[PDB]
Structures are given as structure tokens and as C-alpha cells.
Design a binder for this molecule. Structure first.
Ligand SMILES: Nc1ncnc2c1ncn2[C@@H]1O[C@H](COP(=O)(O)OP(=O)(O)O)[C@@H](O)[C@H]1O
Ligand SMILES: Nc1ncnc2c1ncn2[C@@H]1O[C@H](COP(=O)(O)OP(=O)(O)O)[C@@H](O)[C@H]1O
Ligand SMILES: Nc1ncnc2c1ncn2[C@@H]1O[C@H](COP(=O)(O)OP(=O)(O)O)[C@@H](O)[C@H]1O
Ligand SMILES: [K+]
Ligand SMILES: [K+]
Ligand SMILES: [K+]
Ligand SMILES: [Mg+2]
Ligand SMILES: [Mg+2]
Ligand SMILES: [Mg+2]
Lengths: 525, 525, 525
């Protein structure tokens, strides 16, 4: 189709007007007291909301260029949120500020590549300083406060997350499902999680999750290197006869076996998800034995001398749910008899007092954690199905945020540590003075988040910024209570990973667009 | 339909504006550091890319004339890439420069035929000087670096190509297929390749390949000159009963046999692809015997005294794939028993120590290479299907580039040998001073590739050109590291054939446009 | 439908603008070095061509009057080409020149009929002088050069035509069909050709040919005056039972016979094509006997005493193809046994040494030529089906041109003999001075073809014309090599009939439309 082609600033101002309008609409919702926005409905009384994601979903511009600039900004904010979990409106504010400044600098006739270099290395140095500032978010209080701020001040969600992880542990998995009545319920069910996932994304029947999700499956358990589908065909027929999804745990699947597995799956014959055998060596065989006991399955290992041709439904493990991540797989409610699982746990424990090696110490700790802690299952109790989905979404958002905080730490929330680092990295410079200017652009733009928080709360952005500058460390300004103090004390915990990802993706999009010189779109007809 | 007819400069400016806009959009991606271009998408997030091919795929103009001029330019760049393998954006820059200069010179009231003569003979002289500069690209390092630059800096692809060709050899074939897991695997399978292809393009069921591709076929092997389909009909029925594709390897197929073969193929009765018997004389019979052993087939030769009427499925050779090029056919995974193929290889080897003639020396070297080296089969391991296709297409592009470099050599990359030759052929002149002007046009425009590379990298085109002019030979400027040195050293290898084809097709299109005086299009309604 | 009606110059200027635009687009392709024209296509890559036929296929005008004027011009150029075989662009140049001159003369208030008279008698005198200049094109060299220039410099086509006619002869037919592989093959097959064709065009199932073409037909062979369908009804049923086309060769078919034959054919019962019996008298019966032997048929004559009711499929002749021209019929690959045909040939030869009369001498020469020379069948081998059709069209055009040159001779090509006659018939005058002006118009426009040839080659039209005028006879200017010399020697042969027909049809159209005073078209809505 005939195309409208733009070059340089022609496209750039076109992008930037849409970006700025998008963020002008979004940033009013930043902070605990974001400004009201009435998303118009097709019918009836429209919906009033106060979060950046809600409005960002409801935006389209007649100007195709402004619209697509908004589309890239929304895309990059989504990229951040995937690696952040919150700060979505904060990510939008950062994106607008850095994008607008970078486009204005590009229009100033100065080097775009140097802008990108300065911005990127400044972001790397800021990530390093945040990691230095990153204190480990491990305590149940900090986890509760992370689930609080992530779910827009919901303490109970983070508190229950901390309880579930304490009950089950990291070697297990916490899963969220539909609640029965109106109250959530947590169950430490018989499951496990090992750090081996699907060998091919072709097996993913739930592409949104990035993990194969099978309900009440048959679980083949192989401690062996597999090369041919001829050995596997009777098992495929057996599983297809009962109409259950199929999960393979093998030491290796190679060549024709995997090829015909892919062929049979794309034909829809069998729902097959094949993963690596956890660990290596004898530990792998023992862990397969734990799986076999928990799911009522059996280990198919050549050391037994038994072949895969004669593998049947009882031989294959049975669970109620399995989730096969990229390099991780978890079993939820293994159908295998629970007292048998207890006997296997006692077997692993007697193996524990037989071993003494610290490597073996931690490996057996992991095994007993997987088998006994099982899987945390959360059933969200809510009244209306719309509130059911709302609450569940809050729950997984807080869960992802708590994982990010555990793995990256939490800095003081409210945007005050940003002011701290601005007081710190005010001296950062690049190889070219253009890189210096990009660094200073970043320093300016990165105080904007707190500024917009205070603005939407109805108070003074820059005055709060200056007063925080007067302080140091966690000294800052609760924009909800609007009080100066230690943000950690009043529970405003923004994880290191959240702001880190938001800033990194904002830098990525700003640099990429700074280096953009032409574009092609469709004609406005 | 009523037509918009243009004459002379009326059509010419129409063409040239589209050409110039096309290249203005394309050339920003030239070099290792091409400029960002956001191709728009029909929905959601558009596509950010940095290569001229992708953007060339996404361009259409409302102006019919500018659009259609850009269509010829895209076509001619494709013609170059077919005979080049890369330099696509380089070919686009060359095409714009030469075409624009030639159109301006035509508009200058000056002889177009002389322009074409000057441009063409200058391009021929430049091809001669490039061949003089063409150093043989035969070593694994140079092949790896060709696969690197062709795939936009991908060393591993060229390195694996060098390994595969060392394992299999020239007399075999390297084939790329879908991988099973996430890592590629290379197999030296039992196949072969001889330099005889289809006698009629009608047999090509894969017109894009220019080669008949048959999967698990029946392979008739005839050492005889066929003339009638009456002898062939029982074989056709036998092959059609089993539903396999059919590949004839005959000394000759003539008259009624070929006619009714074409008729039956048009009716879709049998998938028949007939090829010449490799070589001539007794060597041909020996090679048919090698094929018969490798594919489990039999040689149908009149010297045995047996007739073709009694040819059946077991008699016909069996492979897993066959690819019949224009004058070349390769067999991939011959179903014939492998130890039998080994016995045949030992037979050819004992024939080797029976012979002593150098002609026979090399013929038997070729035979043993074909039979033992077989076919290299590469299964590209990738996660997502989109990245699967991306990686595979990179692989075949680098493969075509490596073949071109082997058959033509590599000159120093980055556009520095172009500056060398400009310093060299600055004295080239034509019979008419118009031909001289065309030659000087070529000399000017041919430094533009490096200029645009340095421009897109963000640095000075003409200053780099001058500094290279100060140097000689492989002295030049890495536009990625942006350093002056020997462009051969850091792997910047542009094959002789790539730039040769790009320049030749640019000259062809420029001369054709220079000689064009009128054109007819549809009315713009 | 409501009509736009134009009178006199109102229509005439409308006509002339379309004619002039058509020729302005076409004439750039005249000569061996015609200018490039890029026919813009609906999709993909447009088509670059250099011949007037291709561009003439690609023209339509929004102006209804100009469009339909160009439609008459294209029609008359087709009329010329049918009676010429080439000079299509030459005919277009002549048509534009004469029409434009005729219209500027009519607009001068001067007699149109006198213009017509002058033009027509000038064309007749020029035809007479061309025939005087016409040297017989009979040798294989001249035939090869005719097939060369006709196919735009293709020597091999004319050379193979000369070989085929030497092998088969005038009394046979040279047929061109699809080749099997990639090379053509010539076969002197058992056929014949006699100078009697269909008695009714109703029999023509191939109206484009003007000849009934029957594939593998049943050939009734009669030596009798037929009057009734009753005798043929059993034969019609016999032929319809086997589903073959039917060819009658009878001394005469009259009245109800032919009428109900037409009825049965229009009902589609039988594919009947009835022709005259060749010659008259006993020679006719003997020639029917030759047919009966060659096609395996039988002669149905009353001298035998046998009746037509009992005529069956074996009695009817069998061939593989028959082509029934207006007054000529040829048989290609008579199914009749070949050694039987040889016995019949020996029979005719012994008849030869029994006869002595020169009339009988040449009649028997013709008979033996028909029976032994048979039919030349050319199977054009080519790679692509598009190139197959291209080559077939080239071959048939060269064949028609060679026939025209054999029957009319060749004058020196390149347009130099036109300049010769302009030196010669400069003195031609008409009865009225208006007729004189028309004659001078013809003289002026007659040098225009060479002028346009030299123009498209990029050189001086009028200077070449003057230098040729300085010479005489075959002295002229090769516009490809651009050299002064003998056109006959350097292979540039333009047949007398080609230019004769082009000029005659140009004169016809010019005179007709000059005498046009009004016309009617549809309204432009
Ligand atoms: N008491 C508080 N004082 C100051 N800032 C807060 C407080 N509670 C939450 N915030 C910050 O305000 C933001 C709420 O904005 P919100 O509309 O949720 O956008 P996002 O979804 O991007 O976080 C959070 O990112 C959080 O860091
Ligand atoms: N390190 C380098 N220094 C200078 N030039 C390079 C370097 N690496 C690659 N190139 C050149 O840059 C070009 C990459 O441009 P690209 O967008 O791939 O266009 P194309 O597809 O036409 O090659 C290659 O043709 C290559 O010759
Ligand atoms: N070597 C030559 N020198 C001069 N004239 C030539 C030569 N070869 C061919 N011609 C003439 O040029 C014409 C080619 O024009 P072409 O595009 O084929 O138009 P047309 O199809 O009407 O002939 C021929 O008619 C032929 O008479
Ligand atoms: K909020
Ligand atoms: K590139
Ligand atoms: K021509
Ligand atoms: Mg929030
Ligand atoms: Mg490239
Ligand atoms: Mg011609």
C-alpha cells in the first residue's frame, strides 16, 4: 500500500507530540494520590480510574505518527513492567522526559550516537549505584510492603505471599487459582519445582505464560538419553487413549524422537512437553525417584534395564497441574499417594544423615524442600467475577514484584533515592560533551518521578525535591501522608529491579529513537 | 485501460524522484551502524530495523511513476543480490547514485547511448581490476569472515560453513533444514552431488528453488538413451502406486518418452524429474553404480541386457531427499544400506589403485568425494519459529556469499578497495567525451558506498574517503571500530562477486534508464 | 445510447492527436537500436521492451476519439503485418506520417479525393518499381537473413527454415510445434500438401488459423461428386463412434450432402472438414491413391464400383494432424504404414519413367515431392514456457516473412531503397495538382522510416538520408554498425512484400480517413 515516508525531524516531532500527550494523560495518575481520569465507555456511565495502565490501554490517536509513538512508548513501558512489576506510570514519566529531551537534543544538530552512549552508560552507572543501594528484600515485613506498594497499598497480599513462601520455600512454587467462597485459602500441597524446563517452545500450549501448562497429565519419567520416536510411540498411544496431557522428564531427547514429538504435537495427537532431567549424575536419578513417588510414577532409567516401549499410564506420573517454564518445571498436586510421598521424604532424610558433604548438604536440602514444601496454592476468594479477576491480577503483580525485590532488593520508595543518586551522580560525564549532556538530561529527568507523584498528590514537586536534597539516604517525603522521614519506616518500598528495569527500557527507547532518521507508515486515507 | 503516457524527461524526473526517495530511506541502514528505521505495522507496535532489505520490503508510493521506478530499482538490487548475496543497501546506494547522475546527464541534452557505453565499459574494466585484486577466498578463516559480514557480523555461521565443507567437500552438498532443539547440528550423511540437472524446467515442482526437490523419492537409474514412453509406463505405474516422487537418471531421454513424461506430470500423475547421466562413457556407468549402491537402487543399462519395462520400486533408487538443479543433482540420505555404500566406496578405492592416469585420478577423487562426503545437513537450532526462519535465512545467505567468495574471491571490505580503484581507474576514458563523463560519473558514485557507511556510523564520509586515499591497498577505515588499518585483518571481507554484481546491475539499470525515452502507465484514478 | 457526433475537422484533429501520440510512443523502437520503453505493469516489475508490437499492445487513450483513431491505425498496421510479417514499427511510422500529412492537407481546404488518388497511384507506381527492384529471395543465405531481420537479427531461425524447405520442399509444409527438451528438432515426416482447401469456412474449428486443424483424424478419400447426406450418414456414425475428427477429400460435395454436413457439424456431431480433390482428371485419382497409401486410407471412386455407404474407419485415412487452408490442405504424420508409402512412391516413380510429357513431368515431380518430402515438423526446444512461446512466435514470424520474400523478393534493408526511390520517383505527378501534392507527401514520408531508424539508433536521420542519396542502389547506412556500404552484403534484407504491404495499407487507411467527413462515438460519461 502507498506509504507516507518521513525523514528525521518530520517523523521525530510526529512521534514526540504523541509521546508527550500520552504521558500528559498518564502522569496525572502517578503516586498514591493520582488524579482522577474518566475513561469514556461505549455506553452507560463511564469508568473512573487512577492508574497509568488503565488509561494507557485506552489510548488511540487519529494522527498515525503520534499514535505509533504512543505505541512504542506503551511497548517499552510494558517491557519495563515485565522486568519491573510496577512503576508503570513511573516508567511512563521517565520515558516521556528522556524521549522529549533526546528528541530536542537531536533537533539541536548534535550527535545522536553520543546521546545514546551518554544515556546508556549513565543508566549502567545508575544501575550499579542502585545495586550498591539495593538492600536485600528478604524479611516478611519487606515482602508484605512490596506486595503493598505493588498492589497500590495492599498489605494483606504481600503478607500472605510471605507466609506462603515461608510455608513452601523457594524450591517449591506459589500458585494462584480461583477461590471457592469469598475468602482466599492457601494450601501447601504435594508438589515440587526443579530448574529444568521445556527443550522446545513448540511444546508451549500456553504461549502467554511462556510455560507449558498441563492439567491432570501423564508424566513420563526418563533418566536416559532418547534419540528415536519408535521407542516412544507405544507411550504416545497409551497417553492419547486416556486423553491426558503428556510431560516427559528425560536425561536427553535427541533427533528423531524430538522431531516426531514435534510432528505429533503439531498434528494435535498428544500434548507433549519434554524437559531436562534436573541435576546431573546420581542426584538426577534420585530426584526422578522423588518425582515418581510424589506423582505415583516410575523412573525410566537404563540402570534398571527396562525399556520405554513397555511404559503405560500407571508407569507415567500423575499430577493435577504442571507448569513448564523456560528452564524450570513445577508439579502441583501430584496424584501419587501422599503417604508414599512421605515415605520417600523419609528416604531422602535418611540419605541426609548418610551424607555429610556440603554440596550434598544443600542438594538434599533442596530435594526435601521440593518434595515436602510442595506447591503453595492460593485460591482467591472474591464476590464478583470482575473483582475476582481484579484481586487475582493484584495478587500475581504483587508476587512478581516480591520475586523481583527478593532477587534485586528494595530502595526507599516515593522517588527519594532518585533524588539521592542525583545528588550523587551529578558528577557523571561522558567521553563526548554530547554524552555529558545526555547524562545531565538523565539526571534532570530522573527527579521527575517524585515530582509528578507530589504533583498528582496536589503538592509542590520541586520544593519536595529540594527538601529531600537537603536530607540524605532514606530521608524523603511520603506523598500520601505528605511527611518527611525514613521511607523504609513508613513501608514505601520500591524494589531495585522495578526502577532499574523502567530506567533501562526508557534509556533503550530514547537511544533507539535518537538514532532513528527515517520511517515509513501508511497514507492517511 | 486508458493510459497515462510520458515521454522523455516527463517520465525521467518521475522515475528519479522515486529512486532518490527510495535510496534516501534505504541508505541510512548502510554499514555496520546503519540508522534506525521504524517500519510501521498494521497494528500495535511497529518494527524497528536497521537493514536495507527489510525497509525495501515495506515501501510503496502513491505516485505511480515514482513507485514503479522504485520497483525497477528494487528489482535490479534483487538481481545484484542474487549474483551478490549482500551489499543490498550498497547496491541500492550505487543504483541511486549512478541512475541519478545518468538521468541528470540525459537531461543535459547529451548523448544517452554514449552514457551507456561509457558506464558499461567502465564497469567491465572495474570488474577486471577487481578480479586482479580478487584474492581467493578458500581458507576457513576467510569463509568464516564472509559468513560473518554477509550475516551482518555472524562469525559462527561462516565458521560452521567452513567446517561442513571441510567435512563433506565440493563434490557434495551442504543443506540447511529445521533443527530439533535449540542448537544446530551438522551431519555428514550418505548422499552425493553430480553436475547434471533437469532436462526440462517443467519438472520443477519448486520453482523458487530452480531445482526439483523430491522427498523420499523413487530413483530410476538408466545408463541408456531413452526415446519412448511405452517402455516407461510400467515404471510410472509402479512409482505412482507407492505415491513417491520420481527421479530419472538416464543417459538420455528423447522424443515420445520425454513428451509423455511432461504430459503425465502436467496431469499430475507422477512427480518426474529427469536428469543427465553424470559424465560420459564407462565413468558414467560407474557413477550410476555408485548411486545405485548409495540409494539401494540398480543401474538400468543395456550392457546388462535388461529392459526398462521390468523396473520396479526396489529397482529404483531410494533416498530421503533429492535436489535437481539446472545442471546439478544431489542426493541426501540415500535409503540404501550404508555398509553397502561403504563396500561400493572400497570398490571405487580399489579402482583407484588400479588406475594411474591423472584424468582418472581426479575423476575417482570426485567419485569418492561424492559417495563418502555425501551431503552436509545443517539443522538450525532456534527457539521461536520467527527466529528459526531468521537464523536459517541468515545461514543460506551466508552460504550463497561463501560460494560467491570461493568462486570469485574477496576484496577488502568497508568500501576501501573502491577508493583504491578510484585512485587507480581515475584515468579511464571512453571513445566519446560523453563516455568519459559517464566513466567519471561512475568513479564519483562508487566512493559513495563507503561514504554512506561512515555517514550512517555517524562519522565523516569524505574525510574517511580522503584518508583512505592517502593510504593504499587494504589501508582503510573500519567503520564499526572506526579505525584505520588493514581491512582484511579484522574480518571486514567483501567478496569480489558481491560488489561486482551490484555494480554490474547498477550499470545495467542506469544505462537502460538512460536509453529510455517513453513509457506508459495506467491513469491515476 | 446517446452519441457524441463529430463532423469534419472536429473529428479529424481528434483522430490526428491520437495517431501522433501513438506513433510518438512507437517510433522510438524502430531500427535495430530502438529506444527503451518501460510498459508499466499492474503489479511487480514493469516490462522493458524495444519493439513496436509490444508497446502497440499496451496503449489505450482516455480520449474516445483519439483512442478509436489509434484503433484504426493499430488495425491497419495489423493488416500490413499480416501481408508484411515485419516493418510493424516501420508501418506505424509510415502511417503517422501519411495520416498527419493528409490531415494537414485536408485542413487546407483542398480536395480529399484528389489526395486519395495521388496517394494511391503513387503507391501503385512504387509497388511496380519495388517489384522491378525485387530480386528473388530464394537462396538459403537470403532466407536465413530474412528470418534474421524478421526475428530482429536471428540468423539461426532463417537458416533452419532454409534447411527445412530444402529437405521437404514447396509441395510439403513446414510446421512448428512444441519442443521436448531445450533444443529444437526438425523432422521430415510422412505427410503432404495439395492446393485444395475447405469448401465452407463453417468447418473451421480454428478460426484464427483460417484453416481447419484436426488432430489424429479419420480421412475419407472420395473421387466423386457428392450430393446427399444419406450416403455419408453411416460414415458419420462410424467416425463419431471412434471420436476422431473427420476430413473429407472428395471430387465434389453438393446440395443436401454439404448442407446436412454443416447441420451435423453445427450440432457438434462430427468434426467434418471437406476439401476439393487436388487437380482434375486421372491425376486426381492417382493423387488420392497417394493419400490413401500415406494415411492408410482408401480412395472412394466410382471406377472401383464401390459405394460410400460402406465406408468405415479403416477405409478412412488416418493421420496425426491435418491443416485445411482456404485452398490448400496438408497432412502431417499419416498413420498409414511408411514402407507402404515408400511402395507408393516407387509406384509414382515408375509412372515417372513411363511418362515423358513436360506437363506430366512437373505433375509427377509435385506428387513425389508431396509424398516423400512430407511435412517439416519443427519442435522448438526452450527452457521457460514464456520463452517457448517467444521462440515459437519468432519462428512463425520468420517463416511468414520467408514465404513473403520467396514470393516477392527482398529489397535492401535499413530503409535505403526508400531513399533510392525518392531519388527515382521524385518526378511522379498526378492528374490534379492535389494528386501531385499527395505524391510529394508520399515521397517525403517515405524517407521517414530510415530517418526514425537512425534517430532511435542515436544518430542523424536527415544526414544519413542525404549521404544515401549521394549513393545509389544498395549503397546505404547500416544503423546498427552505423556504416556506409551494401545492405545486401551485410545481411540487412527487407522483403519487397513487407514494405509493399505496409505502404499499401498506410495509403489505404490515409485515403479512407481523408475522405471521412463525420463519425459517431458514444458520449464520454
Ligand atoms: N505513601 C506513598 N507516598 C509516596 N509515594 C507512594 C506511596 N505509596 C505508593 N507510592 C508510589 O506511587 C506510585 C503509584 O502510582 P500508580 O498509579 O500505581 O502507578 P504505577 O502503577 O506505575 O506504580 C507507586 O509507584 C509508588 O511507588
Ligand atoms: N566493521 C565494519 N566496518 C566497516 N564496514 C562494515 C563492517 N562490518 C560490516 N560492514 C559493511 O556494512 C554493510 C552492512 O550494511 P547492511 O545494512 O547489511 O546492508 P547490506 O545488506 O546491503 O550489506 C555490509 O555490506 C558490510 O560490507
Ligand atoms: N543492422 C541493421 N541496420 C539497419 N537497420 C536494421 C538493422 N537490423 C534491422 N534493421 C531494421 O530495423 C527494424 C527493427 O525495428 P523493430 O523494432 O523490429 O520494428 P519492426 O518490428 O516494425 O521491424 C527492422 O524493420 C529492420 O528493417
Ligand atoms: K496509584
Ligand atoms: K548492517
Ligand atoms: K528492433
Ligand atoms: Mg503502582
Ligand atoms: Mg549486509
Ligand atoms: Mg522488426
Amino acid at each position: 500500500a502507498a506509504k507516507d515516508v518521513k525523514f528525521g525531524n518530520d517523523a521525530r516531532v510526529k512521534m514526540l507530540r504523541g509521546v508527550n500527550v500520552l504521558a500528559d494523560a498518564v502522569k496525572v495518575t502517578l503516586g498514591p494520590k493520582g488524579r482522577n481520569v474518566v475513561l469514556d465507555k461505549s455506553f452507560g456511565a463511564p469508568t473512573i480510574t487512577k492508574d497509568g495502565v488503565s488509561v494507557a490501554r485506552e489510548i488511540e490517536l487519529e494522527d498515525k505518527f503520534e499514535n505509533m509513538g504512543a505505541q512504542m512508548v506503551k511497548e517499552v513501558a510494558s517491557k519495563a513492567n515485565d522486568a519491573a512489576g510496577d512503576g508503570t506510570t513511573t516508567a511512563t514519566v521517565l520515558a516521556q522526559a528522556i524521549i522529549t529531551e533526546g528528541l530536542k537534543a537531536v533537533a539541536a544538530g548534535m550527535n545522536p550516537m553520543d546521546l545514546k552512549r551518554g544515556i546508556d552508560k549513565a543508566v549502567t552507572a545508575a544501575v550499579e549505584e542502585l545495586k550498591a543501594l539495593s538492600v536485600p528484600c528478604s524479611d516478611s515485613k519487606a515482602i508484605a510492603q512490596v506486595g503493598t506498594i505493588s498492589a497500590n497499598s495492599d498489605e494483606t497480599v504481600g503478607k500472605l505471599i510471605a507466609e506462603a513462601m515461608d510455608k513452601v520455600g523457594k524450591e517449591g512454587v506459589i500458585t494462584v487459582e480461583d477461590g471457592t467462597g469469598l475468602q482466599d485459602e492457601l494450601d501447601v500441597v504435594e508438589g515440587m519445582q526443579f530448574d529444568r524446563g521445556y527443550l522446545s517452545p513448540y511444546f508451549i500450549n500456553k504461549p502467554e505464560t511462556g510455560a507449558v501448562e498441563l492439567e491432570s497429565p501423564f508424566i513420563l519419567l526418563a533418566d536416559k538419553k532418547i534419540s528415536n520416536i519408535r521407542e516412544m510411540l507405544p507411550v504416545l498411544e497409551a497417553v492419547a487413549k486416556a486423553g491426558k496431557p503428556l510431560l516427559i522428564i528425560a536425561e536427553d531427547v535427541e533427533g528423531e524422537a524430538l522431531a516426531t514429538l514435534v510432528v505429533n504435537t503439531m498434528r494435535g495427537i498428544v500434548k507433549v512437553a519434554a524437559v531436562k532431567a534436573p541435576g546431573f549424575g546420581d542426584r538426577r536419578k534420585a530426584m526422578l525417584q522423588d518425582i515418581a513417588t510424589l506423582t505415583g510414577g516410575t523412573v525410566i532409567s537404563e540402570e534398571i534395564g527396562m525399556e520405554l516401549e513397555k511404559a503405560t499410564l500407571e508407569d507415567l506420573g500423575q499430577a493435577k497441574r504442571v507448569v513448564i517454564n523456560k528452564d524450570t518445571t513445577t508439579i502441583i498436586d501430584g496424584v501419587g499417594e501422599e503417604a508414599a510421598i512421605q515415605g520417600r521424604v523419609a528416604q531422602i532424610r535418611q540419605q541426609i544423615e548418610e551424607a555429610t558433604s556440603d554440596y550434598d548438604r544443600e542438594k538434599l536440602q533442596e530435594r526435601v524442600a521440593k518434595l515436602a514444601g510442595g506447591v503453595a496454592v492460593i485460591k482467591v476468594g472474591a464476590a464478583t467475577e470482575v473483582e475476582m479477576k481484579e484481586k487475582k491480577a493484584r495478587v500475581e503483580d504483587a508476587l512478581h514484584a516480591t520475586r523481583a525485590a527478593v532477587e534485586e532488593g528494595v530502595v526507599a520508595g516515593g522517588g527519594v533515592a532518585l533524588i539521592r543518586v542525583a545528588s550523587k551522580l551529578a558528577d557523571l560525564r561522558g567521553q563526548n560533551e554530547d554524552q555529558n549532556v545526555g547524562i545531565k538530561v538523565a539526571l534532570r529527568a530522573m527527579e521527575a518521578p517524585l515530582r509528578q507523584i507530589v504533583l498528582n498528590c496536589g503538592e509542590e514537586p520541586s520544593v519536595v525535591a529540594n527538601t529531600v536534597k537537603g536530607g540524605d539516604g532514606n530521608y524523603g517525603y511520603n506523598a500520601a501522608t505528605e511527611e518527611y522521614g525514613n521511607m523504609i519506616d513508613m513501608g514505601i518500598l520500591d524494589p531495585t529491579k522495578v526502577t532499574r528495569s523502567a530506567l533501562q527500557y526508557a534509556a533503550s527507547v530514547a537511544g533507539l529513537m535518537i538514532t532513528t532518521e527515517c520511517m515509513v507508515t501508511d497514507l492517511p486515507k
